[PDB]
Amino acid sequence: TMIDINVGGAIFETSRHTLTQQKDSFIEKLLHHVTRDKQGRIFLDRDSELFRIILNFLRNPLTIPIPKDLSESEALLKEAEFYGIKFLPFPLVFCIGGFDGVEYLNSMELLDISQQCWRMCTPMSTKKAYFGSAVLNNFLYVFGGNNYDYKALFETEVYDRLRDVWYVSSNLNIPRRNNCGVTSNGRIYCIGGYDGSSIIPNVEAYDHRMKAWVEVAPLNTPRSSAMCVAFDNKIYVIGGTNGERLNSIEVYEEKMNKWEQFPYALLEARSSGAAFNYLNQIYVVGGIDNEHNILDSVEQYQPFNKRWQFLNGVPEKKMNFGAATLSSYIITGGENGEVLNSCHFFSPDTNEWQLGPSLLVPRFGHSVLIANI
Template identity: 30%
Template structure:
């Protein structure tokens, strides 16, 4: 509701025609064509019949400002001011226009309508009417007094009303969508009934078309003229009361005879299905009601295809078509006893109808299943899109926040002004925790290789070293590790956009020296140990389940291993198995669902690093059982072979390595014994290794890049 709107009296097609030329109306919400999600029209007990019979809704001329925005298919509702109920669900069968019927809702057509802003309608789904106390919370913003509201609905309101109404689907027969024929206040649908039925034709006829006798006959809908219609003037609720007793009785008697005789024909055993189509009111299951209504609509559609549009008739008393081969005229009015004798369908004909109905039910079920699968697929695509949007938002937030964060330079002799310093988070590397030679760390620092800049951000909830790290949906997860005295099973995640840490579900057991990998939107914690035992365990974290699930174990125990992922395949290399240092490696392909050995590395390695550059694995440094090494090996998955290449400038283990901008960066680590490194080495294809910076002593840390 916009501020400053003036609440005024609404004049509707259900109210008495305005006699005061100075009457006013409520200001519209003025929703644009693309904002309009639905429209509510109004009526009273004395006009609801004409609205639904003629399939035409109308409002005073001043409401045309938004009625003109109605397109075919737009959801519509009908509010009865007499009983304060909302009827639906309808939809527009034409665009909103002025004066579709210039004489609608007038006594004898001698004067023009007071409600020229009109739209033709058809029933989308016949539901039980909603009480005002049910629908008012949905359109609360439209109320400008306790009992008056604006008729324009935005998309959210329309969707909620449709969902609310759909919870109470009515089993009553609904209006077919019919061509609209107008004359100068003549009847829209001229009845074919005889003068004797003239009085009866003044009722509220829901069928404005001649049904297809081949289909509707055995549905018990057109066997005689006993379709009674009524509208409760006091309650404002339109009802269609159907009864075709002769056909129902004959069909049930026929089924009883077939079942008693033990006939194995297709009709035997389908008594429940036939009864569901013979008498809608006996069906209690909501899904069967909906299917039945769709079948009836199909029956009417078939009938319309054989009848010229000018032959549609307004016929409150449904025509008494005969079954094939029994003769009879649509103009004749015969007695109930004669119909019971003459209109009995042959068993073969009924069997064919039932077979067709069963086939259509199966087709509807198959269609529903297909639509359900499509909806699930689209929902998943929506989740993926929202994830990508969140990633972009996080990056944008980081761009804004980094420029304002406190900084420190690795080279104090090269201090630059803040205005000259430009750091892009997506071109930077985050370093977490570790040990600096004096204390265990909980710090989170951002390092920009191109500028030699370190910036501190919100630290972790606890000091953490020997931990694994992986990213998922734009956030960074660090898990396991320890503080030099005890091992953790705790997990926490970091949001770069908010610069904050959040505790997450814990691992199934405490461990450190493990590998962390993200694949197919899931995080894997691979191997590790607790200072006493080495593990081959693999755990997977599924964000939807919010817990770690035990997966198929490695073929070997591996502590201080290194892990990585290429094209959805997980790789685990080296480590310590409790007895010896390993040069073996293995992979897990989700399509194969088991770990298998691949070619072994040329050197034993533990506490080393493993990164992926241009589709190949790089194993960097580590400890071979005797000393830290500087050697580097490359694994080509297509050849299943390792190749030794140029070593790093310094031997190092317990370091951290990251690939950024087609370059490998290796940070600090341990060179030998208790001698720690403070250098940063960089590798780029065609240029080899070079030391590019000094960041301070640090080891046992983790690193990641966005």
């Protein structure tokens, strides 16, 4: 069955199967009194050209659009989000930067799901470790860090996967390493770290309308190598060091621009691990404790019990690893005396860990970011 649709005055003719192959999308749902044109065709008051690109993708999903410039790339992704269209039916898992034992890295690895192995990807321009990272509108952001040229960086680089290019974005106000990065309600937060001389409490937010980083309310305790996770309009900043490694947690009420103390501290004071969340539960993994032991332990916060409890640990002790959450949780690389290339997946369904494919370049001080284009 063929359908004619009007988008921005332009007429597109296609099958219903083409427009509805992605279940629960806006276009699929749209197929109730809808606005129609003078010929009785479904009318959408949206950009014709962006729709033409998206439709040509739907006609052959094995080929991904190549936007002609940054503006079109951003516009295409926002338009696909509106229509509820994803250009790939799997996540893109990126391993970025870090330190291999002798050199700072600008290299990036991408998990190849069909081949079940990591592959080398497009490198960023600046080699660096211990930086903050976040995803915003499915662009990858990396900011701060250190390398051989600077003990504390202010540069922000951004990766556009559709055009396969890195570009330079806005400078941090306070150059820093061992800072946390997290996305919360459409902004990126750069949190704490070390400015080259001192551990700092400062927090900066990136707003993509402003195209700039601006200082917001600071942490109440300076923290470096902390762990952070954001959900339910809050940002949780967990552990880290102020000179001593901490079990305390701070919470940013994003809507109030205020930091508050979380009432329930970690069981093991620690820095240099990672935190993540699933549903309303918070998980903290790995890192190093205040007696300088490198950790494999995992802690889970259960809201019903209002306490942290241990789970089974990760299969090896590690700190300064890269990690990110999938729909699952992946941890890659890190260090524990040696430089690691190991990768493991955590399942909240079993609370157990599964071996994954190993990185091409053993590294620590790197980041993992996921794009869902």
